[PDB]
Design an enzyme around this catalytic site. Structure first.
Site, PDB file in Angstrom:
ATOM      1  N   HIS A   1       0.816  -1.218   0.000  1.00  0.00           N
ATOM      2  CA  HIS A   1       0.000   0.000   0.000  1.00  0.00           C
ATOM      3  C   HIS A   1       0.849   1.267   0.000  1.00  0.00           C
ATOM      4  O   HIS A   1       0.283   2.335  -0.281  1.00  0.00           O
ATOM      5  CB  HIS A   1      -0.988   0.030   1.170  1.00  0.00           C
ATOM      6  CG  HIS A   1      -0.451   0.437   2.503  1.00  0.00           C
ATOM      7  ND1 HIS A   1      -0.097  -0.500   3.454  1.00  0.00           N
ATOM      8  CD2 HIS A   1      -0.215   1.643   3.092  1.00  0.00           C
ATOM      9  CE1 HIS A   1       0.339   0.111   4.545  1.00  0.00           C
ATOM     10  NE2 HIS A   1       0.282   1.422   4.350  1.00  0.00           N
TER      11      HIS A   1
ATOM     12  N   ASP B   1      -0.250  -7.567   1.995  1.00  0.00           N
ATOM     13  CA  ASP B   1       0.252  -6.201   1.845  1.00  0.00           C
ATOM     14  C   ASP B   1       1.774  -6.207   1.807  1.00  0.00           C
ATOM     15  O   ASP B   1       2.420  -5.969   2.825  1.00  0.00           O
ATOM     16  CB  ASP B   1      -0.301  -5.359   2.996  1.00  0.00           C
ATOM     17  CG  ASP B   1      -0.081  -3.872   2.816  1.00  0.00           C
ATOM     18  OD1 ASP B   1       0.352  -3.486   1.711  1.00  0.00           O
ATOM     19  OD2 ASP B   1      -0.322  -3.090   3.778  1.00  0.00           O
TER      20      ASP B   1
ATOM     21  N   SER C   1       4.196   2.748   8.196  1.00  0.00           N
ATOM     22  CA  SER C   1       3.819   1.747   7.213  1.00  0.00           C
ATOM     23  C   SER C   1       5.001   1.258   6.400  1.00  0.00           C
ATOM     24  O   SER C   1       5.831   2.087   6.034  1.00  0.00           O
ATOM     25  CB  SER C   1       2.838   2.302   6.158  1.00  0.00           C
ATOM     26  OG  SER C   1       1.550   2.445   6.710  1.00  0.00           O
TER      27      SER C   1
END
Ligand SMILES: CC(=O)N[C@H](CC1CCCCC1)C(=O)N1CCC[C@H]1C(=O)NCc1cccc(Cl)c1
Ligand code: NA
Ligand code: NA
Lengths: 27, 249, 9
Positions: B43, B99, B196
């Site tokens: 992502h 992910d 992230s």
């Protein structure tokens, strides 16, 4: 291979300030 | 990172910063897994609901870093991307299943006291260490709550899967695990925006090496009571990692 | 907020 062994810690036999917290959890 | 602390120098020499070229800025975290391969969250590169789609040339990799903003002359190294690979079954539509993405570097980075790759788990390390209650470590340069001067670190325990599930309305898969303290526990802390793509690592008590078991993937809010951070389960997607690195050398 | 990188990269 040489992975996962930090020059300024494991390779010198020095421990960082909180890694023992991880060890002590491996119960 | 929320409720973490200043990293020590060289404490995370596999940490990578995903940096936007123009306008120059922190995009995400990531990790060094050999001299030419960087691991991150899918992502961070591809997320259509935010009109996020980056290409190679939008980006640079900064390795060896400690300060968030400063350019660390004689310490950090900056690298250009030769090729981005995203998991063919990354589910950005519903829940961020799988992910994970690899980034191949134009040139090999040179290892140093501040630059060194983390290990990727084998099935036996995974089985031994991915247990509820065991703690891992997450690192990154994201927000301090819902930006730091230097790399931040926080140690967090893996959470039982029924508790992960019951904490959210999202559909949780076997390609994820969650981590964090319960309200009942006193201690707190979490990843947050800008973290992230960074690594969740554990130190094997069997061979004293650091392994990357997770990738910072998602959460609802940051460090909210009764909520937990979700991590891509690296061992569960290793066939694809291996595959990718094999063929693409 | 970012010290700009060398032009080189
Ligand atoms: C609640 C929310 O909107 N936030 C989402 C959760 C959700 C996104 C849509 C798919 C299923 C997960 C989220 O956390 N996202 C949406 C895309 C980026 C990622 C993120 O912020 N990651 C940062 C983060 C924050 C807190 C803990 C972790 Cl482990 C990671
Ligand atoms: Na639920
Ligand atoms: Na929480």
């Amino acid at each position: 291979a040489d992975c996962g062994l930090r020059p300024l810690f494991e390779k010198k036999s020095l421990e960082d300030k909180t890694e023992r917290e991880l060890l002590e959890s491996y119960i | 990172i929320v409720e973490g602390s200043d990293a020590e120098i060289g404490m995370s020499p596999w940490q990578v910063m995903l940096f936007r070229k123009s306008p120059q800025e922190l995009l995400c975290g990531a990790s060094l897994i050999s001299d030419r391969w960087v691991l991150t969250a899918a992502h961070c590169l591809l997320y259509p609901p935010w009109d996020k789609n980056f290409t190679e040339n939008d980006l640079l990799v900064r390795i060896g870093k400690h300060s968030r903003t400063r350019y660390e002359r004689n310490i950090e190294k900056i690298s250009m991307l030769e090729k981005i690979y995203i998991h063919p079954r990354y589910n950005w539509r519903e829940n961020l299943d799988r992910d994970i993405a690899l980034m191949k570097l134009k040139k090999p980075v040179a290892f140093s006291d501040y630059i060194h790759p983390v290990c990727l788990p084998d099935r036996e390390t995974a089985a031994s260490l991915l247990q509820a209650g065991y703690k891992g470590r997450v690192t990154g340069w994201g927000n301090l709550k819902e930006q730091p001067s230097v790399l931040q670190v926080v140690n967090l325990p893996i959470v039982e899967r029924p508790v992960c599930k019951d904490s959210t309305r999202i559909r949780i898969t076997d390609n994820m695990f969650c981590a964090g303290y319960k309200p009942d526990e006193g201690k707190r802390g979490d990843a947050c925006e800008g973290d992230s793509g960074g690594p969740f690592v554990m130190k094997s008590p069997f061979n004293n090496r650091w392994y990357q078991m997770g990738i910072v993937s998602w959460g609802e809010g940051c460090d909210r009571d009764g909520k937990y951070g979700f991590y891509t389960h690296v061992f569960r997607l290793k066939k694809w990692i291996q595959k990718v690195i094999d063929q693409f050398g | 907020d970012f010290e700009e990188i060398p032009e080189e990269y």
